[PDB]
Design a protein around this ligand. Structure first.
Ligand SMILES: [Cl-]
Ligand SMILES: [Cl-]
Ligand SMILES: [Cl-]
Lengths: 271, 272
């Protein structure tokens, strides 16, 4: 039976669109108001039952490590000033039920190589993948929505979003047939199809629950290629999750996320 | 059938005996001539067929990571300064089939906590543990000697050696009975006994092949010796008198003698 307790977070984003701010920190450490992108994704994963966090690092790996590892000198300067809500902000980033490990990717070779880099830490277990640039604000954690489908259907699950047909050249797009109102069986995947040639308008977003059989298909490359090959052996579903995704891969999308989440969680309003 | 492919290296040694040098470097990064202690132990593990290296770090974890991760600017400065045979000493520390991952221990709480810290990376597999302060110079990698026993006899294996009775306060000491001329079946283990009350003079050194059932005994409630003792009650634990010379680099005296001896053997260095 399916138990998903490990999650892989590629956190070596170069973030060239955000240079020079990403000169000394990876893209996934840039904050939305007061919280790095990667912390939203970690909080989602932990809310969904993940206990083993696997960070795949690159340049400036220290920004990631220093964020999630304990910081005694900080907690010192904080509790000497009797700051309890603030200590909890730092110390309690992770519950004590949760552990992290770090693996350096050999070179920036894309998401399929980042996932394969995590194999020694995953073993022969299904596992999650979360791309922190896809900042999802949802009433129920999206990874949990995906895990629940993966356990019930017994297969890998890709998170998908309905997108305008005119925009399909921006995304990986599934070819799939409905099996219920939100979940589909995937038969093919196509990267950046022309709008009139796209098989659906269901775009892959950066939330995956993958069976460990994927690793052998990544050793045979791109993650979409490894999933395409996985389908020929095992079951792969897509699930149109309930939630609002902010694409923080662009400055525009990162800016709208700051506005929207600044408003909703911080009562910040533009002049 | 036993497959040992993962090895845990606790590398958060405070090395208070070596302060101030270990202020900004963990103890396991101190070099013996031209090589950090931890690289000798990694090279033994790799020669023994280990492919997944698991470093349990603490303070100054950066020195460990930067030593084993790639360093492109150094291959640059090497190519500009003229060297090229030096590239192999740097790029080729690890073979291409070997990977490293880093877990931070939650606090310096002893070897048993350090082993348990590696549990998420090891899973339900037998695994090796190597303490880099125990620098071992052997014709055959000691970890290989122990893994071969572990596979043949289907149990955990502690690396052991005879020590003077007077020194038993420094070691975990096994009570055991012989199974062949080098391997013993462990019946008990005692942490730092008084010389006159030590059950034997067979000391555990820092090489171990442990079955994954040890993790649950390290969670049951903290010392590695207690985990092994509990493991004995349910599973087989052997001790193996390995072939090789062990230098106790945990003291300044033992690190000094490793530098003199390996200086002589491998670098042609002789006190004047
Ligand atoms: Cl640094
Ligand atoms: Cl310690
Ligand atoms: Cl634990």
């Amino acid at each position: 039976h399916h138990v998903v307790r490990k999650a892989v977070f590629p956190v070596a984003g170069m973030g060239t669109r955000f240079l020079p701010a990403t000169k000394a920190m990876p893209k996934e450490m840039l904050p939305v108001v007061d919280k790095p992108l990667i912390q939203y994704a970690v909080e989602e994963a932990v809310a969904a039952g993940i206990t083993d966090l696997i960070f795949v690092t690159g340049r400036n790996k220290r920004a990631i490590e220093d964020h999630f590892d304990a910081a005694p000198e900080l907690e010192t300067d904080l509790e000497a000033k009797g700051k309890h809500e603030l200590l909890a902000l730092v110390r309690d980033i992770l519950p004590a039920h949760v552990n992290c490990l770090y693996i350096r990717q050999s070179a920036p070779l894309g998401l399929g190589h980042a996932v394969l880099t995590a194999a020694p830490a995953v073993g022969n277990e299904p596992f999650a993948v979360l791309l922190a640039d896809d900042l999802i604000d949802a009433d129920t954690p999206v990874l949990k929505q995906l895990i629940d489908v993966a356990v019930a259907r017994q297969g890998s699950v890709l998170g998908v979003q309905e997108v305008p047909r005119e925009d399909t050249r921006k995304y990986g797009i599934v070819a799939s047939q409905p099996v219920d109102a939100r979940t589909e069986r995937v038969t093919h995947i196509v990267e950046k199809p022309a709008p009139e040639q796209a098989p659906t308008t269901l775009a892959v977003v950066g939330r995956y629950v993958l069976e460990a059989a994927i690793f052998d298909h990544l050793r045979a490359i791109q993650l979409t290629d490894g999933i395409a090959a996985l389908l020929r052996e095992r079951d792969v579903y897509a699930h149109r999750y309930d939630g609002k995704r902010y694409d923080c891969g662009s400055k525009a999308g990162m800016f709208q996320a700051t506005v929207a989440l600044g408003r909703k969680y911080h009562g910040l309003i533009p002049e």
